[PDB]
Amino acid sequence: ELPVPKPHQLKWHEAEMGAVFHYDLHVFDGIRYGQGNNRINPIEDYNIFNPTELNTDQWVQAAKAAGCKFAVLTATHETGFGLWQSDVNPYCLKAVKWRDGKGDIVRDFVNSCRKYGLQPGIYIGIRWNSLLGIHNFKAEGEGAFARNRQAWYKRLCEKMVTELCTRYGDLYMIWFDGGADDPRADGPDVEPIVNKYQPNCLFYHNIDRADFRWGGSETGTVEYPCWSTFPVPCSHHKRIESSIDQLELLKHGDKNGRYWVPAMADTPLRGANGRHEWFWEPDDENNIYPLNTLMDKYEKSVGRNATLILGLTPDPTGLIPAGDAQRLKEMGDEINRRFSSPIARISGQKKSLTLKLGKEQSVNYCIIQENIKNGERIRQYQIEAKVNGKWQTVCKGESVGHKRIEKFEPVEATALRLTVSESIALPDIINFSAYSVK
Amino acid sequence: ELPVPKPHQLKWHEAEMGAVFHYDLHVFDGIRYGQGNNRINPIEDYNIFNPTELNTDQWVQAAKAAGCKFAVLTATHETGFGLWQSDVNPYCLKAVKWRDGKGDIVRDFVNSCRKYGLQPGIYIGIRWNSLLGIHNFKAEGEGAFARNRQAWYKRLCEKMVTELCTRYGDLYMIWFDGGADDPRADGPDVEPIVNKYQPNCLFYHNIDRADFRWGGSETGTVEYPCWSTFPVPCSHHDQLELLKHGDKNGRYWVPAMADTPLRGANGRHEWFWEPDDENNIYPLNTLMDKYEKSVGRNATLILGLTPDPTGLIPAGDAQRLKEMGDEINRRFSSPIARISGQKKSLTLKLGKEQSVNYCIIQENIKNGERIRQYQIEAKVNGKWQTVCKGESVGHKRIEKFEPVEATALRLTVSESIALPDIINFSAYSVK
Ligand code: NA
Numbered sequence: 096e097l098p099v100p101k102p103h104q105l106k107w108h109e110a111e112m113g114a115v116f117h118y119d120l121h122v123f124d125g126i127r128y129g130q131g132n133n134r135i136n137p138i139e140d141y142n143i144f145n146p147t148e149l150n151t152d153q154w155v156q157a158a159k160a161a162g163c164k165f166a167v168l169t170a171t172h173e174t175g176f177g178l179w180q181s182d183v184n185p186y187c188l189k190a191v192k193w194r195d196g197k198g199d200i201v202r203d204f205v206n207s208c209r210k211y212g213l214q215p216g217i218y219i220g221i222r223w224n225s226l227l228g229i230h231n232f233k234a235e236g237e238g239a240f241a242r243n244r245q246a247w248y249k250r251l252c253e254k255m256v257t258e259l260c261t262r263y264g265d266l267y268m269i270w271f272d273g274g275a276d277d278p279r280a281d282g283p284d285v286e287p288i289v290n291k292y293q294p295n296c297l298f299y300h301n302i303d304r305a306d307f308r309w310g311g312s313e314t315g316t317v318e319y320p321c322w323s324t325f326p327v328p329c330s331h332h333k334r335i336e337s338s339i340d341q342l343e344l345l346k347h348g349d350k351n352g353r354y355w356v357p358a359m360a361d362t363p364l365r366g367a368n369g370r371h372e373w374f375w376e377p378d379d380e381n382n383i384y385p386l387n388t389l390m391d392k393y394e395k396s397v398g399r400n401a402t403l404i405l406g407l408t409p410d411p412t413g414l415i416p417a418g419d420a421q422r423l424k425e426m427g428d429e430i431n432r433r434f435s436s437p438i439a440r441i442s443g444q445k446k447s448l449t450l451k452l453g454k455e456q457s458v459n460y461c462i463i464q465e466n467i468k469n470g471e472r473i474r475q476y477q478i479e480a481k482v483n484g485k486w487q488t489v490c491k492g493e494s495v496g497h498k499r500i501e502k503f504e505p506v507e508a509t510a511l512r513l514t515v516s517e518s519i520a521l522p523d524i525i526n527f528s529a530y531s532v533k
Numbered sequence: 534e535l536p537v538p539k540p541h542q543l544k545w546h547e548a549e550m551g552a553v554f555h556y557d558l559h560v561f562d563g564i565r566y567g568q569g570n571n572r573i574n575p576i577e578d579y580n581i582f583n584p585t586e587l588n589t590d591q592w593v594q595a596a597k598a599a600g601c602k603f604a605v606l607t608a609t610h611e612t613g614f615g616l617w618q619s620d621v622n623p624y625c626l627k628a629v630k631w632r633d634g635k636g637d638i639v640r641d642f643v644n645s646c647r648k649y650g651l652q653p654g655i656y657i658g659i660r661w662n663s664l665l666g667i668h669n670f671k672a673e674g675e676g677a678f679a680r681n682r683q684a685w686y687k688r689l690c691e692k693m694v695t696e697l698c699t700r701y702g703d704l705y706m707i708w709f710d711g712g713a714d715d716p717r718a719d720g721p722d723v724e725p726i727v728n729k730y731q732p733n734c735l736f737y738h739n740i741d742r743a744d745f746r747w748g749g750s751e752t753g754t755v756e757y758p759c760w761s762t763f764p765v766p767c768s769h770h771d772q773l774e775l776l777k778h779g780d781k782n783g784r785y786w787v788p789a790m791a792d793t794p795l796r797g798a799n800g801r802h803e804w805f806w807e808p809d810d811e812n813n814i815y816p817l818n819t820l821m822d823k824y825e826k827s828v829g830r831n832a833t834l835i836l837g838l839t840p841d842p843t844g845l846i847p848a849g850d851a852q853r854l855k856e857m858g859d860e861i862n863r864r865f866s867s868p869i870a871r872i873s874g875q876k877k878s879l880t881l882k883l884g885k886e887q888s889v890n891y892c893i894i895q896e897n898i899k900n901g902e903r904i905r906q907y908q909i910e911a912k913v914n915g916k917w918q919t920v921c922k923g924e925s926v927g928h929k930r931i932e933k934f935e936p937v938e939a940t941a942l943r944l945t946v947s948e949s950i951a952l953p954d955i956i957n958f959s960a961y962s963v964k
């Protein structure tokens with residue numbers, strides 16, 4: 096039997112785009128983010144946290160305007176501070192003067208997602224905790240002290256995960272910063288918690304399981320071909336065969352893999368001019384990616400069978416900056432301009448599909464989509480255009496999966512033809528469409 | 534020039550007795566206190582903190598009934614949990630469901646003290662913080678991260694001290710667990726904070742300064758003689774000896790403190806509430822022997838009291854404390870006769886021949902410890918006989934002796950370093 100997505104993985108492929116919102120205490124410190132420093136220098140005064148104009152509806156609407164279907168918030172990251180009303184991590188919103196210690200930004204956030212029709216997910220950082228002395232999943236120290244403290248920390252994390260999985264409705268994903276390591280060793284035993292309380296939630300990830308994989312870079316792209324199948328049911332370097340070039344495997348997948356671990360692409364929005372910022376920092380207004388760059392990334396992520404996650408940055412007032420929001424809207428508008436209305440479209444469970452265009456006209460893009468619930472069946476394909484009554488090949492490829500965007504030098508054509516020359520089962524093509532884009 | 538107390542040290546001597554109340558999360562765990570394990574292992578669920586019957590007025594009332602004139606609360610101890618509304622330590626009453634995260638036991642406590650006329654003080658336990666993995670101020674780990682956390686923790690201590698010294702009025706004392714060490718090394722730089730915001734608060738203690746010294750045991754007694762003077766302005770390094778007697782020739786005023794848990798009987802010695810200790814409170818007669826060997830030996834006595842998981846001083850403890858105050862009053866409130874003077878000799882005429890078995894002597898402590906050798910004689914059948922002999926007097930000396938049928942008692946100071954200033958020479962007969 097062909098590998099196929101589990102039922103709860105269909106929403107991963109179908110979403111195509113989502114957003115992650117990073118927010119922690121250092122956003123309010125008036126200086127740039129230094130990751131190395133932040134992980135090992137506990138915050139001096141947590142009352143710098145004071146987003147007096149906080150509005151998670153504005154965050155969600157801003158992401159939605161780009162085409163995002165899901166949105167994720169960092170409940171914790173590296174400081175140890177938690178953006179919810181926790182009864183186990185005292186270093187949370189209960190501690191601060193803002194909102195009289197009764198704020199719960201995770202709640203505001205999941206409510207906003209649902210209000211606008213985006214599926215909410217939660218990111219949890221357990222790998223680094225500057226307050227509590229955790230570095231690369233490990234409680235610092237030695238001997239009985241460290242063994243006992245590690246056992247305690249694992250339970251603390253289990254309890255935090257339990258709160259987040261039981262008090263905020265059904266979640267799209269749980270994303271752990273760098274995963275949740277190994278439950279038989281330093282990592283918390285979180286998979287059973289997510290399975291019990293969040294059976295349809297994407298679990299991302301630990302040594303035993305990843306419901307999707309990081310595509311090998313934060314460029315907002317994957318490589319080509321890009322398959323959803325994978326040799327192991329996780330993305331952990333300790334579980335991939337030792338002779339494999341692992342980054343190449345993340346970037347491409349393994350067409351012969353027996354596990355469904357589909358590709359994720361990600362990038363901060365604020366990645367221009369030599370910056371690469373997951374958090375809001377001063378003087379980065381003009382470092383948002385241009386629309387043309389975002390479109391290149393879209394075509395090389397969503398158009399290469401990977402769901403794309405954009406990193407968005409609420410500011411110290413509690414809002415997505417105006418410029419960022421405008422750029423996001425421009426991205427969504429441009430995706431719609433290019434691809435919402437094809438010249439023609441056709442579908443079928445066939446190895447060949449001919450798209451008649453109605454009249455001779457210009458064509459420079461095609462979209463092909465397989466019915467992903469039934470697997471990646473297409474292994475080799477070609478697209479031909481009928482130009483002056485003669486078929487000529489305009490492109491060739493391998494993987495299709497959920498979505499393939501092909502762009503080629505424009506031709507005046509009366510028809511396009513998709514031929515699947517190699518396949519492991521009868522292709523189930525839900526979309527073969529042509530476009531003319533200037 | 535004789536050493537003398539500082540103006541703010543007078544209230545130390547004058548108080549004579551006080552109470553310290555220990556309270557931390559492990560009180561609520563249903564099992565006995567294990568210091569070694571509590572220090573190291575973090576509390577698994579801090580919501581066990583739910584004293585539904587909490588009333589600090591009851592704590593203060595209970596202590597007042599024993600004769601306590603000051604009361605001290607552990608704002609923190611070893612878990613790192615803080616019993617106030619802190620803006621720097623997030624592991625405090627803001628974190629719990631109890632009182633909807635708005636409780637402030639330090640505030641309740643200082644208000645209660647003032648309501649009942651007891652002077653409030655605060656104990657700050659900072660050597661150990663189990664939440665944060667701090668062991669004698671040190672953070673664990675081999676590198677920059679551990680050094681950073683250790684320096685950050687020192688600042689946290691300084692900030693908590695600042696909150697406690699600025700938001701709760703004037704304090705009687707600030708008590709640092711085992712002292713706050715050396716601010717040039719691992720200790721927090723807390724003396725300048727206390728000096729700035731609490732200039733008349735007893736500072737106890739660090740390498741540079743101790744406003745009083747621990748008498749060397751937790752027996753509720755000091756040895757005799759017991760002098761307030763000391764060779765250094767602190768209690769930091771026979772040390773146990775020096776703590777036990779002081780130094781009559783010392784240039785610094787570092788007066789003696791005696792302490793004991795109330796729950797110190799039957800092999801137990803408990804500063805915290807634990808289950809099944811109700812019968813381990815000290816008998817009244819034993820508490821009185823201790824009072825005579827602390828207060829009656831120029832040492833202010835601190836009783837360790839234990840609020841329970843409901844938030845009250847247990848009923849049996851409160852009754853025993855009342856019994857103690859009542860008995861101090863019964864024995865010493867009404868003398869047969871009393872006299873005072875700036876003299877080397879004072880005679881107490883009794884009024885009629887009658888039995889006598891106790892005397893109290895008190896120097897005007899603001900003027901120092903002038904008496905060095907003294908004797909008390911009783912006039913029995915018209916002839917003087919010596920009933921006791923001593924050295925140090927200080928704020929208060931209690932002498933108990935085999936009863937004699939006397940018509941007068943006479944105090945003679947045979948050796949002194951300045952004219953004695955005796956505010957009280959009294960005789961009693963206690964059945
Ligand atoms: Na910053």
Ligand code: NA
Nearest residue numbers: 559560564565
């Ligand atoms: Na206990």
